[PDB]
Structures are given as structure tokens and as C-alpha cells.
Design a binder for this molecule. Structure first.
Ligand SMILES: O=c1ccn([C@@H]2O[C@H](COP(=O)(O)OP(=O)(O)O[C@H]3O[C@H](CO)[C@@H](O)[C@H](O)[C@H]3O)[C@@H](O)[C@H]2O)c(=O)[nH]1
Ligand SMILES: O=c1ccn([C@@H]2O[C@H](COP(=O)(O)OP(=O)(O)O[C@H]3O[C@H](CO)[C@@H](O)[C@H](O)[C@H]3O)[C@@H](O)[C@H]2O)c(=O)[nH]1
Lengths: 456, 447
């Protein structure tokens, strides 16, 4: 009996790939202990966890209760759990060592590598990180101590050239701004965590050769960093049935059934809102001006804090009236089944902030992407898609809040992506490779067996 | 040799519309009409309607009545500011009217201007009248108010105002405009000064007819409201005219109505202007989606009013439209898809609903609207809820609103009565109808 322990970080962007990896390991007949930091931050995490545990009642949920963290750096509830874990991870050792059956391996989130590395070494089992973003973004993370020691860093630097990765030249404009400030916490965490990769037994990435061939080969051939552990491309993590909410109104699917094939552009900027009010108006104005059918999924401005503000409060009355007249667009404020949407033949395009889970899903369903990266890794992820030729993004729009992107710019970008058959044909090729990756003898099965060979 | 009539409307679409429709009726009787236009006109809606009217009837002489701007200490209401200017600059009219060819035969001015215009009309020496733009029952209340004010029970003790023989026999205290219950109010003083001046007119024109206000028309002309009141001419219904149609209007509203089952749409409009708070408007949208009926909601310009679930149902279910524009209300009320009218019960909308046989869910907000709503309810082609209160008194919730909408839309007794009111409205404008008879009686003394 192979026993694997899993510890995701906070946020749907981390919990979703971890529960999909858990599903993959259960199919390989592993016994899975899912470590759950408590109290969980968001309701969406609560609901997905209960839906997951219901679908797989054989998995053992180990509750990891966290004392309250009071930090002067940030009040964000997601950051405060992260602060709790790296100050109170000593509590995990008794819960993990005194555990039956004996653990065979430990897989935790890459963001928790500093607190969890001594915990894993005290358990004496093969331990790994699951990185929830692209292999190209991981290459940047692994290369960062080398990059920060250059005299070009930070002012002179124009392009970051990491040997052999899928994005050969990363401009300074695509680097997350805090990583250019040696005084930022982000910079400090990268400089502390990246050298610890050598202590790991391996790195798991939700990616496949069909989208990141160069980055995966560069990471595994000692090209990016000397002494890196093996990097396992175990993607794509395909959506699972337990994610689907049990009782949905079906009205979104019923609306998609009434549109022509490839007619609808789907817009989602991620699990949470990272976009200001003035920019959100311009988004709705751009969708109406584009002339294309659209399904725009918006989130609550603050997580789990609903408001009575109308859609004309956000977008303005005339924009809303023109929308209901032309009959071409839906705007919903809810947690949708994004896989049901991307898998529908009426959807011909995806306006995405390029969070990596949404990028892999679009690859799985062969939907071309109009990238609107906002923060963090998203500009690097968007260029991974652009390099593959199944997506496009406007590098001049900037990080979120740098400038106001007008509705006419947005409409012209939408019309560009929705009319480009070259992007659609390349996305269909990416989809074919994504389907091959999870077939029998495909890259995902090969990579999983290579992991399972050590465990037992 | 021609009969010449001068018309002076007060500010607002609720006053210009009946006056221009009266002008159309008078032009059909071969009168030469002079339209006195207070300038600058307050709203753009009045501008565009006036130009469409003059363009349709180029034989009408427009006399511009230039007014000095009232001061900021007078009011923030642009319609009261025109009132204040007219009261002080009415002396200007006497030169313009006495030096007018062909000489004037009669003079019809808005009732709200009866105080500054009465001495002007008497110097002209022609028969002069008021056009009251609201219901005959509301007029009976206005004419009876000096009698009511000199009562012992006025104002605190009174529970019901009983005007002898009118269409609504007992007007509850809760239906009286609140300022008229305050003997120190400005509204009170204007009522007390203007009402006795009615006895100095040659007659009163009301946009009404026997089909909707038989009792109060009888009581007014029978001396039962005020002894020696001049004759009251029921010259309604004022029907929509062609010049009101905007020549190049979109068809999104009509095309949407053409796709709905007959009698399935609730039309919702609270009048010519905004008169409802935002948190209340948010409940109107919730009530429309909760009612389950198709709706056409017209909103007037003054956090959002259009909730997310409301917009979703309009796009997925195609259940509703919400517009913020000057719609063609007559085209909407005349469409067979429309089966109900949620109205603030401004009198022109009431008469139009009667003209098209559309039952009314009354939601009175200010002034005469509770009295008008009961005129409809007494006729049996409408319903209103007394407990909702004046605008802003309390928050009427969406579930209350949805319940009232489902009541009116399902009530065939109201629809059949509205069809009967419509048949009387059509009869009133036919040969030998009450409108013709009242117009000939009104014009017999004009030379
Ligand atoms: O209405 C919704 C919204 C989201 N999802 C799902 O939720 C996941 C969202 O994940 P992702 O696309 O990564 O968005 P975020 O979670 O916002 O992305 C965060 O996490 C990513 C992975 O670490 C990073 O790449 C991003 O920069 C970071 O913002 C996806 O699987 C979606 O299918 C839904 O099912 N319905
Ligand atoms: O979008 C619109 C709105 C209104 N109308 C027309 O404008 C007129 C509105 O007149 P009315 O129904 O009287 O509304 P208001 O002008 O708001 O009513 C005011 O004036 C009335 C007549 O004096 C009074 O009875 C009311 O209490 C007072 O609020 C009607 O003919 C409607 O057909 C349109 O054509 N389109």
C-alpha cells in the first residue's frame, strides 16, 4: 500500500490542481492523506473540499489547525494562512510521523517549501513540491538566484535569457514588479526558497510537452540550474466530476445551446477579482463594442462579502441597457463550472488572465486565448501560450492598474482573436497533444509510473 | 372672419401634452390658434414636442413669452422657477395679446397659472377658461378646498373628505397631499388663493369623459360641489396625435413586443420625470422578476438599480426590457402584448390607458395621484394598495410588488371593465359623442 500525503496552499488556484493530482494518485491505487489547513480561507475551498471528500471517502483528511497570525505586511486572509503555516509547521510532525499506514511520500505546495522542508526531512520519506504554474515560470523561479547576482539586476536588465526554456527572452516588463525590488517580501521569499530546490526529490508541474517542450527538457537536462531534482510533467490535470456543483440551474448551458458554434467569447479573470472599477466598466464596454457574443463571469469584489450593487453600478446603466437590447451577452456573478463552458462548442475564444489552471483547461478543450495578464506569473504564462501560437496578448496594456485599457482597444483585440483561424487551428493541435498525454502509455502515465517506481 | 384662441400651457410634459392635443382638437374645428410658449422652455422633451407640433401645424402662431430667470433663492425645481417668473412677468402678455391680429376670441390657460393670468384675461375682455390637466374628481377637491379648510375638523380631526356626489365619495385623509394638511405650507396658500378665483372664469376644460368620471362631472355642473361654479366641459379623452411620434425612432421595443404572447407584458412607467428613490427602484426590479410576468420597465434619469439576477433573466429568459429614454407610450399601451399598466396615475397616462383599454396597477407617488388611482379603482378597471404610502414613507418590498402585479395581470374582471371603458372612450370622440357636444357648447359664444 503506497501512502501519499498532500498539502496544498491557500486559494482555488492551488487547491484545484492538488485535488486533481489526488484523483490521479487514487486511480493508481494509492492511499491519500489530504492535509487541510484550518480554518479554510474561502467558501469555494470549503465547497470543493466537501465535494471532493464525498466523491472519495477513502481519503484521510488530516485537519491542520492554525493559530492566528498577526502580520503588519498584509491583512489578506490568504496571506495570513501562508504566514501561519511557515510559523506553525512544527505542529505537523507529530500528526505525520504517528500515522498508519506508514507514509511513502510527501507532496506539498511549492510556496511552502521553506517551512515544510525540515518537516519532510524529519519523516525520512521522498518529498516533492507540486508547482501550480507553468514549467517556464518554474524555470524563472529556479534561475532567480543566478539572475539576482548579476550586475544587470535590477536596473540595467532588458531581457532574461534562461537557457533553453520555452520563452527564450523574458522582457523586464514581464517580470513581476516586486521581484525587481530587492527590499520586497516577494524578492526575499524567492531568494530564500529557490536554493532549497536541491533538497527536494522532485518537482511536479501540471504541464505537458505539447505546450512546454523546451522548458521541460531544459529543466531536466541540467540547463537551467545545476543540481535540480527531476521535473515531472504530469499534466494536463483534466477537470473531474467532483468539481461539478451538484445542483446547477443549467441555464448557462441552455443559453450556450442557443448560440452558433464558436460564436461566444468566454471572459474570466480568475478565482478572485483583481481588477478596479474603472477598468471593469471598460471591459463591459469593450465586450459590447466587439459585436461578438460573450459570457462574462465576474467575482465578488471582496471574497465571501456579497454586495447589493447593481450591474449598472459597476458598468453603468446605458451599457447594461444596450447589452440587454442586443441580446448577445451574459454577465454572471457566481462560481461557474468553467470546464462545462470551455468544453461547449459554442465557445470559440477565452479572455483569460492566464492563471495556469485556466490555461491548461483551455489547452485540454482546444480554446484559443486572448491573454489579459494582471499580476505575478501571468505575463510569463501568456507568452508561453503566445509562443505556442494558440493565444495572443497585448504587451502594452500593462500590469493591472498601470493604465486604463479602453473599451475600443478591448473590442479590437476580441475581434482579432475570434476571427483568427490560425489560433484556432493551433489550439486544436494543442488539444490533440493534451489528449495524447493522458492516453495509455502517454506522457502523464509515464511520468506517474516514474514517480511511483521509487515509492514502491 | 375666424375664431381665434390663445393657449398658455404650464411647464412639464404633463401640461404641454394635453394642451397640444387640445390645440389639435381646436384646429379641427377651424380655429386659428396662438400658442403662447414661455421661454426658455424648461426641458428638451418640451422642446422636441413643440417643434414636432409646429412642424405638423404650420398654421399655428407661436407667441414667444420671454421670461427673466428666477433667482436661486426661489427654488431648485426648474418647473417652479418658471412659475415664479410667470407670476412676476405676466404684465408683458397684455401688450402682446391686445395687439394681435386677428383679434382674440377666447383665452385658455393652465390652471396652475390662474392667479397671475386672471387679471390679464379680464383686461383682454374675451371669454377665458382654464384647462385643468388632471381628473375631474381632483378638480372637485380643488374647488371644494376653501369649504373644507373652514371646517372645525380641519386638519387634524378629519378622517374623510366627503365632496357631495363626486366619483370617489369619501377621500381619505391618507389620500390628501400632505402639504395641504399644513395650513402654513406654501402649497396650502396657493390652493386657498387660487380656488376662489374659479368663480371668475367662463368655464373649465377637463380631459375626462362620462365613461370614467360620470358622477363628478354631474356634481360639478349641478352646483353640488360649489354653488355657482362656471360650467365644466368634459372634453376628453385627449387621444395621442401623430405629431407626438418621433420621426426616426428605433424599433427594438416594438420588435420585442411583437415576440410576446398577447396580454403577457406588464408596462411600468412612473411618469414624465424621476420621482422615486434608488433603494425603492431596486425593489421594483426585484418585484418584476419575482412576479414571473414579462415586463417593459421605463426608467427616468435623476450603486445600481439593475440587479444581476434581473439582467440574467432578461438575457436568458428574454422576459423583460429596461429602457431609459422617452418612449412612445401610446405605441406601447396600444400593443396587444401589453396586458397591464403599472402607473403612478398621472392623469394623461390614465386617460391613455382608458383609451387603449389597459387595466392599471396604481402606484401613486405624489400630489393628485392617490385620488386619480381611486377614480380608476372605483371604475373597476384598476387596483392600488393604500398601504404602500406616499413616495418615501416606507420601502415597498419586491414580494409585495410581485404579488400586486400577479393580481392585476390575472384579473379578467379588470380587463373586461377596461375594455368597456375603452368602448366609451371611442364613443366619446365619434359623431354625436360627448367630446363634440362639449366642444360645440364651449365654442358657441366665441366670435
Ligand atoms: O467561476 C469560476 C472561476 C474559476 N473556476 C476554476 O478555478 C480555477 C482557477 O484557477 P486559475 O485559472 O489558476 O486562476 P487563479 O486561481 O486566480 O490563479 C492563481 O493561481 C494560479 C496557479 O498558481 C496562478 O498562475 C495565478 O497567477 C494566480 O492568480 C480554474 O481551474 C477554473 O476552472 C471555475 O470553475 N469557475
Ligand atoms: O417615456 C415616456 C413617458 C411619458 N410619456 C407621455 O408623457 C405624458 C405623461 O403625462 P402624465 O401621465 O400626466 O405624467 P406626469 O407628467 O409625470 O404627471 C404630472 O402631471 C399630471 C397632469 O397634471 C398629474 O396628474 C401628475 O400628478 C403629475 O405628476 C403621457 O401622455 C405619456 O404618454 C411618453 O410618451 N413617454
Amino acid at each position: 500500500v503506497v501512502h501519499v500525503a498532500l498539502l496544498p496552499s491557500a486559494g482555488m488556484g492551488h487547491l484545484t490542481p492538488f485535488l486533481r493530482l489526488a484523483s490521479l494518485l487514487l486511480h493508481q491505487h494509492c492511499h491519500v492523506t489530504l492535509i487541510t489547513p484550518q480554518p479554510t480561507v474561502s467558501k469555494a475551498e470549503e465547497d470543493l473540499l466537501s465535494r471532493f471528500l464525498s466523491a472519495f471517502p477513502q481519503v484521510n483528511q488530516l485537519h491542520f489547525h492554525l493559530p492566528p497570525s498577526d502580520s503588519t505586511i498584509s491583512t489578506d486572509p490568504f496571506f495570513l494562512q501562508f504566514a501561519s503555516i511557515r510559523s506553525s509547521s512544527h505542529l505537523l510532525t507529530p500528526l505525520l510521523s504517528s500515522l498508519t499506514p506508514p507514509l511513502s511520500s510527501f507532496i506539498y505546495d511549492m510556496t511552502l517549501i521553506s517551512p515544510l522542508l525540515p518537516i519532510a526531512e524529519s519523516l525520512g520519506v521522498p518529498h516533492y513540491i507540486l508547482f501550480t504554474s507553468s514549467a517556464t515560470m518554474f524555470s524563472f523561479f529556479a534561475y532567480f538566484p543566478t539572475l539576482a547576482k548579476s550586475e544587470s539586476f535590477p536596473g540595467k536588465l532588458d531581457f532574461v535569457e534562461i537557457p533553453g526554456v520555452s520563452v527564450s527572452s523574458i522582457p523586464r516588463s514581464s517580470i513581476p514588479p516586486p521581484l525587481l525590488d530587492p527590499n520586497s517580501l516577494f524578492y526575499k521569499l524567492f531568494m530564500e526558497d529557490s536554493p532549497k530546490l536541491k533538497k527536494l526529490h522532485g518537482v511536479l508541474v501540471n504541464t505537458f510537452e505539447g505546450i512546454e517542450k523546451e522548458s521541460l527538457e531544459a529543466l531536466n537536462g541540467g540547463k537551467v540550474v545545476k543540481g535540480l531534482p527531476p521535473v515531472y510533467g504530469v499534466g494536463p490535470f483534466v477537470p473531474c466530476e467532483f468539481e461539478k456543483v451538484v445542483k446547477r440551474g443549467e441555464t448557462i448551458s441552455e443559453w450556450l445551446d442557443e448560440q452558433p458554434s464558436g460564436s461566444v467569447v468566454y471572459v474570466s479573470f480568475g478565482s478572485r477579482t483583481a481588477m478596479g472599477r474603472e477598468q471593469l466598466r471598460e471591459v463591459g464596454d469593450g465586450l459590447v463594442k466587439s459585436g461578438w457574443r460573450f459570457l462574462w463571469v465576474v467575482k465578488d469584489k471582496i471574497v465571501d462579502r456579497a454586495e447589493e450593487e447593481g450591474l449598472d453600478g459597476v458598468l453603468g446603466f446605458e451599457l447594461v441597457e444596450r447589452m440587454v437590447k442586443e441580446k448577445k451577452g451574459l454577465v454572471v456573478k457566481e462560481w461557474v463550472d468553467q470546464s462545462e463552458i470551455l468544453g461547449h462548442k459554442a465557445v470559440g475564444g477565452f479572455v483569460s488572465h492566464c492563471g495556469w489552471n485556466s490555461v491548461v483547461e483551455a489547452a485540454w478543450f482546444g480554446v484559443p486565448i486572448l491573454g489579459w495578464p494582471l499580476h505575478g506569473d501571468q505575463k510569463i504564462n501568456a507568452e508561453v501560450v503566445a509562443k505556442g501560437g494558440w493565444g495572443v496578448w497585448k504587451e502594452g496594456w500593462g500590469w493591472e492598474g498601470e493604465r486604463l485599457v479602453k473599451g475600443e482597444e478591448i473590442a479590437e483585440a476580441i475581434r482579432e482573436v475570434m476571427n483568427d483561424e490560425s489560433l484556432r487551428m493551433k489550439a486544436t493541435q494543442v488539444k490533440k497533444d493534451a489528449r495524447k498525454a493522458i492516453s495509455v502509455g502517454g506522457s502523464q502515465e509515464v511520468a506517474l509510473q516514474k514517480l511511483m517506481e521509487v515509492w514502491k
